[PDB]
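User: Sequence recovery, please. Input:
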């Protein structure tokens, strides 16, 4: 069996790589160097209560929901502006996102809210962070099923070395 064929899977030039020290993220206009800038053993005790209030006044906290506390870098200047807070009513599954920085996966501290819908942190440096949480609920209003919520990312600056009570509802 000679088999005159092409690539069984097109992977371009080479999977997992870059140009020449230059990263291929190409998302932010400004240098995203700030990933390796946010370093400091801190004592910022964060006490966050997670709940987005519906227009009805109904409080949806966030059951089995992952609260990701990640640093607000120059990289996220472009990312947050594109998506950031996007309602599920416009949750497009066709628009492809760019290659996100893998270093974020190291900095992303996840607080999965069990049932109480509240999370706490300890030993965190000061600065400006994004709390990313995809919380959405689809309920019926009058008769038609609407889908409220979506990707809620909250801009939270941590300047409190003492128990910092924070509410994520917007």
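Assistant: Recovered sequence (170 residues):
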């Amino acid at each position: 069996g000679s088999s005159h064929h092409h690539h069984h899977h097109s992977s371009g030039l080479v999977p997992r790589g870059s140009h020449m020290a230059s990263n291929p993220n190409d998302l932010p206009d400004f240098p995203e160097h700030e990933y390796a800038a946010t370093q400091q053993v801190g004592g910022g005790v964060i006490n966050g209560d997670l709940y987005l209030t519906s227009a009805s006044g109904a409080i949806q906290k966030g059951t089995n929901t992952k609260v990701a506390l990640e640093p607000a870098t120059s990289y996220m200047k472009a990312y947050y502006a594109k998506f950031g807070n996007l309602d599920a009513a416009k949750r497009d599954p066709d628009v492809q996102p760019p290659v996100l920085d893998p270093r974020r996966a190291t900095y992303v501290r996840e607080a999965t809210t069990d049932q109480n819908g509240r999370f706490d942190f300890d030993h965190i440096p000061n600065g400006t962070y994004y709390i990313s949480s995809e919380l959405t609920w689809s309920a019926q209003s009058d008769g038609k099923t609407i889908t409220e919520g979506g990707t809620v990312t909250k801009l939270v600056t941590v300047s409190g070395s003492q128990p910092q009570k924070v509410l994520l509802t917007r």
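Residues 75-82 form the longest helix (8 residues).
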